[PDB]
Amino acid sequence: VNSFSGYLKLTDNVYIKNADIVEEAKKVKPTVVVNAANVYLKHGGGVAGALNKATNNAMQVESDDYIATNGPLKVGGSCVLSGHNLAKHCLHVVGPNVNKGEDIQLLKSAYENFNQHEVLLAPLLSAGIFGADPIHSLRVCVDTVRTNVYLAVFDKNLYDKLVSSFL
Ligand SMILES: CNC(=O)[C@@H]1CCCC[C@@H]1Nc1ncnc2[nH]c3cc(F)ccc3c12
Numbered sequence: 001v002n003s004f005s006g007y008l009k010l011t012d013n014v015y016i017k018n019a020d021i022v023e024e025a026k027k028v029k030p031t032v033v034v035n036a037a038n039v040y041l042k043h044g045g046g047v048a049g050a051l052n053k054a055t056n057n058a059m060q061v062e063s064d065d066y067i068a069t070n071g072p073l074k075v076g077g078s079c080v081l082s083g084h085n086l087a088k089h090c091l092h093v094v095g096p097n098v099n100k101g102e103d104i105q106l107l108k109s110a111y112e113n114f115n116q117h118e119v120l121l122a123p124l125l126s127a128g129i130f131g132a133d134p135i136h137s138l139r140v141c142v143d144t145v146r147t148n149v150y151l152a153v154f155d156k157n158l159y160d161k162l163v164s165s166f167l
Pocket of ligand 1: 021124
């Protein structure tokens with residue numbers, strides 16, 4: 001039993017909800033919140049911009065030190081950093097950005113990072129400003145992640161479309 005409330009159950013381990021991941025993280029304080037990161041950990045917009053703003057830019061400060069030491073992530077890769085005031089840890093995961101021409105076949109590799117964590121609060125990778133089809137992203141998530149994932153979907157209209165079309 002965990003503290004996540006009001007989710008629809010899609011499968012044994014995947015749950016989906018209409019919620020602002022920022023407000024959801026601040027309330028649940030989950031062990032792991034997933035960020036929709038880019039390779040440079042430049043948290044400028046989308047989910048990443050929202051999470052960073054909620055940390056009063058501390059996420060960005062930590063991220064810049066990480067990149068200065070380690071260099072950029074791989075598309076499809078991830079790193080574990082602090083969750084600041086939102087969660088114990090933030091798993092920064094790089095889904096492919098269709099608006100940059102990146103291979104959508106890397107979306108499965110991106111979701112594989114979730115399997116290193118027993119329970120996660122997460123957005124749909126590569127959705128939103130990353131330009132991929134959120135319906136497809138949900139399919140890859142369900143078919144790739146084996147650990148317990150709680151998806152927060154900000155847009156209520158998108159949430160209903162995701163549920164109504166789920167197979
Ligand atoms: C990297 N991909 C994206 O940003 C996507 C673009 C639009 C479709 C959904 C998805 N974003 C989100 N998913 C869950 N919670 C969210 N809270 C937010 C607060 C904000 F200010 C901005 C965006 C989100 C957001």
